[PDB]
Design a protein around this ligand. Structure first.
Ligand SMILES: OC[C@H]1O[C@@H](O)[C@H](O)[C@@H](O)[C@@H]1O[C@@H]1O[C@H](CO[C@H]2OC[C@@H](O)[C@H](O)[C@H]2O)[C@@H](O)[C@H](O)[C@H]1O
Ligand code: NA
Length: 707
């Protein structure tokens, strides 16, 4: 019923795997940690998202922990889907397609996977037997090795593979939490097999400092450690093999967090020989770096690519060898990058290169992943610097992977301003063209953003600064609609940045609630702060859009509604229960004052449905099964109530909805193919009737219009 379009950013997240199909030129796939999988469509020159049909119940399948194609069947595609292994996350599943991801069938697995956990960029854990495509293997993170003999429709544990093989296959992430990393890859040795019969020789890499490489000679019936293997580091990839030489990348951690050592090994099983072939050595002192990935040219078995990982001396490098590891050349330092597709990438640095792949039909064409998208070479074989430099382009059309944290559609200015994880955000001058990030000071996360209802040129945002060590001020304000920004003169005396921020209708007052700090009021952008009187620290404050004297608050811990009529100096408890907010990416109360009427507020919560607060009264407008995220925009007809938009569950069905009768009746405006999991930050456009924006937890921002 609506047409949904991506807000153009360009990648923006960590692509954890890339894969060419050797049976068809121009066919490739990508997997991501938070945002599903993609098929490169040579005819449209774009990546096509393959898992937007995931509904709200299946948000955890957006993390793609592994993927595989059948070398003998260009139509087959297999995804190992599962994002977290913690208690609130469901079991994993193999999604199988026999039309390149157009449709999927689902095999539920009895264990969980780690699509957005440590080791997510190790691969590939899922593999198809290259001589009998009926057979697949899947390495789990904490449940051993699993096998299918019916093209992934049913799975059973490989009883002969010991669970103890995964001993020590855990690690701490950046915030201290232990995670099950388990198996890093499963590799068939195709040279060992013949068409029609299961491949006899199979390698299994385990992300552990103990024995990390296992091999079977009898199609998985028995298992042994590979003789002579190095120990103490964790393998992440195993490539090559067709000429009898295998290439394995190692780090001192599973990745992507915290790598500070590693190695690159060449393994020649016929000679029982192991040779360290790392392009550059580890530092004698100070932090080292890992080898994030290795790949072999499908047409040229002695041609290798290998990436450093978390090299900060000075930055990461990608190396090429054409003689099996004997000599290497650096690639990126002398290369040219085209940022015209995503201008903001000119200020990014290639990093987190945990996956590489070379086009099996054109050795000139190689992909490497970063923590912000894919780069693609044009002339990897043919370049000669400086007159003919290696050329990289941002092959990311159709691929959108940001996790927005807040969205703003102001009464004037750009139609959308975003607050995004990792890359701060944008003033979206054009929704269909990628932009530069906000001018002025640079935040890590953009967490909260707001604009004055009656003076929309005044914008404020807050967020994080990763590895903050120089007292960076984490709230910023603009007076020209987000074109230029200035930091607040100080932070309030309590809290740790981020949180939620709001600005009154005439731009004279800002209320900022830093993380764990409670609410603080300023009338001079942080020159001075006062604690807001009469609110618990867990309250979130929103401004009226019309009357600068009016503000509102919902205590997230209790669901109680508070009200201010003194420009947010103080708040009274209204006596009214509006419900606690749905847990989302950022648990935030859904309180939306009427852009056109002072003192009219629309609210939503899972517990109470959709409500209107006006004239000291709460009216329940409707009671959907779960009202999660509420937005307000221009009425479709003049004189009619403002349009309301809802992401949630109505009559057992999840989706995104619009009400035209003031929130009493809802109509579904997306369809099952465009559910994107659990959309949030539903945001109307006060200037465009029918327009709605919403965030997704790894597929970026979308906007829709009727028809
Ligand atoms: O700015 C890019 C890169 O800089 C490194 O110095 C930093 O350590 C790294 O986090 C950054 O890479 C991004 O990391 C985030 C996830 O960040 C979180 O997990 C890893 C920790 O190292 C971080 O401290 C923590 O904030 C990814 O979402 C991005 O895709 C990736 O670019
Ligand atoms: Na906001």
């Amino acid at each position: 019923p609506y047409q949904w379009r991506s807000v153009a950013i360009g990648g923006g997240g960590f692509v954890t795997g890339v894969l060419f199909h050797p049976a068809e030129r121009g066919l490739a796939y990508a997997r991501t940690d938070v945002g599903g999988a993609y098929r490169w469509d040579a005819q449209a020159q774009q990546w096509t998202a393959l898992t937007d049909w995931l509904g709200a119940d299946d948000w955890n399948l957006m993390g793609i922990d592994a993927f595989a194609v059948d070398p003998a069947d260009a139509d087959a595609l297999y995804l190992a889907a599962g994002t977290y292994m913690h208690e609130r996350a469901g079991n994993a599943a193999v999604l199988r397609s026999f039309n390149r991801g157009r449709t999927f069938e689902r095999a539920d697995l009895p264990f969980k996977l780690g699509g957005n956990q440590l080791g997510r960029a190790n691969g590939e854990r899922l593999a198809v037997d290259p001589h009998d495509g009926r057979v697949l293997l899947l390495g789990s993170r904490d449940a051993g090795l699993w096998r299918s003999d019916d093209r992934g429709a049913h799975w059973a544990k490989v009883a002969s593979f010991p669970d103890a093989a995964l001993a020590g296959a855990t690690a701490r992430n950046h915030v201290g939490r232990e995670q099950a990393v388990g198996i890093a890859f499963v590799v068939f040795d195709a040279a060992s097999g013949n068409t029609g019969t299961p491949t006899p020789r199979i390698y299994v890499g385990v992300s552990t400092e103990q024995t990390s490489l296992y091999v079977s000679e009898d199609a998985g019936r028995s298992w042994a450690p590979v003789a002579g293997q190095p120990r103490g580091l964790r393998p992440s990839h195993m490539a090559g093999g067709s000429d009898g030489h295998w290439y394995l990348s190692y780090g001192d951690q599973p990745g992507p967090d915290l790598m500070a050592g590693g190695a690159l090994w060449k393994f020649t099983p016929a000679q029982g020989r192991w040779r360290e072939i790392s392009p550059i050595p580890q530092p004698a002192s100070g932090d080292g770096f890992g080898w994030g990935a290795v790949a072999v040219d499908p047409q040229q078995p002695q041609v290798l690519l290998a990436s450093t990982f978390r090299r900060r001396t000075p930055r990461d490098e990608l190396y090429r060898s054409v003689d099996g590891g004997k000599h290497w050349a650096p690639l990126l330092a002398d290369a040219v990058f085209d940022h015209s597709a995503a201008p903001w990438t000119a200020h990014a640095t290639p990093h987190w290169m945990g996956a590489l792949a070379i086009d099996p039909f054109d050795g000139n064409h190689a992909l490497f992943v970063t923590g912000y998208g894919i780069w693609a070479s044009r002339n990897l074989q043919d370049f000669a610097a400086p007159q003919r430099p290696l050329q990289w382009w941002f092959q990311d059309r159709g691929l959108e992977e940001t996790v927005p944290l807040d969205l703003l559609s102001p009464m004037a200015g750009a139609h959308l301003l975003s607050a995004l994880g990792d890359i701060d955000g944008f003033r979206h001058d054009e929704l269909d063209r990628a932009q530069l990030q906000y001018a002025g000071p640079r935040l890590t996360n953009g967490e909260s953003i707001d604009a004055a209802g009656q003076a929309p040129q005044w914008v404020v945002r807050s967020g994080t600064v990763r590895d903050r060590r120089n007292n960076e001020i984490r709230a910023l304000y603009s007076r020209d609609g987000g074109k230029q920004w200035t930091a607040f003169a100080s932070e309030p005396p309590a809290g740790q940045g981020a949180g939620s921020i709001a600005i009154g209708a005439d731009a004279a007052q800002v209320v900022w609630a830093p993380e764990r700090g409670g609410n603080w009021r300023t009338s001079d952008f942080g020159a001075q702060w006062q604690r807001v009187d009469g609110l618990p620290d867990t309250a979130v404050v929103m401004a009226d859009r019309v009357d600068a004297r009016r503000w509102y608050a919902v205590d997230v811990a209790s669901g109680q509604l508070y009200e201010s009529t003194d420009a947010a100096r103080s708040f009274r408890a209204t006596g009214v229960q509006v419900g606690s907010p749905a847990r989302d990416e950022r648990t935030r109360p859904q309180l939306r004052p009427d852009p056109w009427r002072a003192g009219v507020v629309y609210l939503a919560s899972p517990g109470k449905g959709v409500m209107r607060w006006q004239d000291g009264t709460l009216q329940v407008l409707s009671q959907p099964d779960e009202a999660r995220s509420l937005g307000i925009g221009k009425a479709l007809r003049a004189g009619a109530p403002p349009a309301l938009y809802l992401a949630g569950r109505v009559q057992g069905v999840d989706g995104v909805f619009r009400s035209d009768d003031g929130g009493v009746q809802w109509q579904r405006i997306n369809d099952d193919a465009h559910r994107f999991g659990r959309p949030y930050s539903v945001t109307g456009d006060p200037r465009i009737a029918g327009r709605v924006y919403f965030a997704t937890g790894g597929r970026g921002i979308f906007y829709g219009d009727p028809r």
